[PDB]
Amino acid sequence: NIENIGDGAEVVKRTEDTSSDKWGVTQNIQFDFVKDKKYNKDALILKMQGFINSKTTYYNYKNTDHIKAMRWPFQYNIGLKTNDPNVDLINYLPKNKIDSVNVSQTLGYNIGGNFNSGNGSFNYSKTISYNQQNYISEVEHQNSKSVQWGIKANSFITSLGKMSGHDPNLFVGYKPYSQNPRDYFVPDNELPPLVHSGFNPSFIATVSHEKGSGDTSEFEITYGRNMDVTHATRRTAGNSYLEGSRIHNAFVNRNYTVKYEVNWKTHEIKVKGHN
């Protein structure tokens, strides 16, 4: 679909969808080519959406009756890179450390290659919107060829008051005598959506390409998680309770990576490969 955005400019919209049962990921990518006569560069707006399954599991610790485990996502990973020397990452959203429950931001474009991370005054716009209850979003790394976000366990309200994402007693349950590993941890109504279900990413990246320097560019988009393990141990003025201990970053970069090829002249998208 083509959208006129004013005098001598239009936007060509394309979409690519890929899922992985191996990683528990759906990448829904929107590629919006900005074709403007008044802008000396080819420009692409990437809206990265979809789903990253939390893959939260509860299992018994070995051959014990009293140590049970919760493997859960400490952090979600969102990354974008290019290997094209003619392509520059010019902007991305969210840009700064944000801890609000809902992250809702707008990228605005104006004829002449003017991008603003602030609608109606613009010729074109794209909006990101995602929930990250109890998590914080931040840029882990960035350069002219890449941007990487971390959406990590941050602040939680528990039965023992406020807890950090690093507290070993985080998510520890109320049933020390149950044989069900799920019972050793707080119920789903006490867990944030990012733990019980997964993450619905909504991220933006704008890339610029030098006019007539090459018809194609490759982009690698990575969606994943880093898993923590919480062990809940039964402890025994004769009552029993549960105590947590943590293996932080027990499983890092459990990521689904997809390589996309973009054609700047034809506006066609191809999935080159994936893991």
Numbering used by the authors: 3 to 120, 126 to 243, 246 to 284
The article reads:
With the exception of α-hemolysin, which is homo-heptameric, leukotoxins are bipartite toxins, formed by the non-covalent association of two distinct proteins, a class S and a class F component of approximately 31 and 34 kDa, respectively, into a likely octameric species. Panton-Valentine leukocidin (PVL) is associated with necrotizing skin infections, such as boils, and plays an important role in the poor prognosis of necrotizing pneumonia.
LukS-PV mutants Y181A, K182A, Y246A and N248A also had a significantly decreased calcium entry slope, from 65% to 75% of the control (p<0.05, one-way ANOVA). The T244A, Y246A and N248A mutated proteins crystallized in identical conditions (50% PEG 200, 0.1 M MES-NaOH, pH 7.50). The corresponding crystals belonged to the P43212 space group, with similar cell parameters (a = b∼94 Å and c∼308 Å) and 4 molecules per asymmetric unit. In close proximity to residues Y184, T244 and Y250, residues R242, H245 and Y246 also induced altered biological activities when mutated to alanine, albeit to a somewhat lesser extent. Residues R73, H245, Y246 and N248 are specific to the two proteins, whereas Y184 of LukS-PV is replaced by a histidine residue in HlgC.
